[PDB]
Design brief:
about 0% helix; binds the ligand O=C(CCCC[C@@H]1SC[C@@H]2NC(=O)N[C@@H]21)Nc1ccc([N+](=O)[O-])cc1; 8-stranded antiparallel β-barrel; about 110 residues; homotetramer; mainly beta; 8 strands; Lipocalin
């Protein structure tokens, strides 16, 4: 249920393929960046979500923010499917600025 | 300088290869699990670290914890070469338990076991 | 703005008073009451930015002790429907061996209308 | 074991009094640089070797400066000759809704009784 196009509350577009091997591969758009990650290819069937995560390093051929975001979350299936995530965005910093290297937030992705 | 075998303060083993276009691939042992991630393949040249992240889903041929961890951090080269990270570990939960789905912590990786 | 009774998406009840000096006091009931204390910016920017704040509950009261504490860090956002948007850290007391898994993280959004 | 002066890895000083029923009150200096803090701790921790859960908040306004932000530290106190308070923290800045996605920094501080 994960493969396809997803949208978050900021209007970002998360395009992903969930491979048989547990891989996530795709692109993330605020402008498009590569992502890769992993998901549980044998989730519980007890009403639990499917655990997953992915990373975008914010460099493409045109731009580079010298940073990377990881999203950690779970896919929740059904008629109103969602991927509910929390994320960590680390910027490359000097040692003096490392204490403020990392932003934290939460994104919810929907198929609509 | 990211490619290699790293260990964190818990004694976990992070074996990683960094590709020229930003890919991270390898294994993690907290009995290995696959990892994949991304890193900044052209970092600033002003002393700043190199941003990176990776994911492990905690399923292999022997175990499944129905969970995934992402590490987000930066590689710092030089005399004290290290990868400093923070991580989010999400377990698959029912909706009723979703509020407690996610653990947070911080791991520092070096080339020497603890 | 901040003073009042708030509810999060879980249906928890956050009863808070914001003192002129920057103090937050009150009670929290997660879906009996627990004591909370915290702080807020009592002279926020006047440029449309939210008001930074945070508070702590240690999960011990007369009835129960979970041996844990949550801190919520966030901002009050004035609006047609006023919000307090937070992220939180819940640390349980653990042995050293279990310290790696001591801390849950999440996010709660509060309004003065119960969902 | 919590009342007293604590120092973290950044050079900050955390001065706190732990009251009998769970109050934390004191001051935090990220080095004019002193700010009020308040929080809560578990005043009846487990007796199985587990740490003592606690949390506190600083809003970064004093009489001389206002950074329009607040940090909460959530963690546990671990006793012994080399007592420590191990924390994770969330620092929320007041922002517009458009910048709210980047409102919150996260990190970790270790406090000890010596510098
Ligand atoms: O490094 C960056 C790159 C862009 C990050 C977009 C974030 S990823 C989490 C969230 N979910 C989304 O769909 N989009 C946002 N930007 C950046 C980093 C730091 C600051 N800063 O002011 O500190 C400003 C911009
Ligand atoms: O889901 C799991 C799988 C194993 C996670 C190992 C974590 S990854 C962050 C940290 N860094 C490491 O090198 N190792 C640890 N375990 C798990 C999850 C939740 C709970 N729990 O009690 O909630 C217990 C075990
Ligand atoms: O220690 C506890 C005490 C209750 C915590 C309620 C949390 S505070 C963040 C969130 N917002 C709310 O309004 N309510 C929830 N419970 C607890 C801690 C850990 C685990 N665990 O399984 O790890 C289970 C229960
Ligand atoms: O809002 C501020 C006020 C000072 C925060 C000090 C932090 S509290 C967590 C950590 N532990 C310490 O002892 N000290 C640091 N500063 C601030 C906020 C954001 C940015 N920024 O660049 O985004 C810069 C400075």
């Amino acid at each position: 249920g994960i493969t396809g196009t997803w949208y978050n509350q900021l209007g970002s577009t998360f395009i992903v393929t969930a491979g048989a091997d547990g891989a996530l591969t795709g692109t993330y758009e605020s402008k498009r960046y590569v992502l890769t990650g992993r998901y549980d290819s044998a989730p519980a069937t007890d009403g639990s979500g499917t655990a997953l995560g992915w990373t975008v390093a914010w460099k493409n051929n045109y731009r580079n923010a010298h940073s990377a975001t990881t999203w950690s979350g779970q896919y929740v299936g059904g008629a109103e499917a969602r991927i509910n995530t929390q994320w960590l965005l680390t910027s490359g910093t000097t040692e003096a600025n490392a204490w403020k290297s990392t932003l934290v937030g939460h994104d919810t992705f929907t198929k609509v």
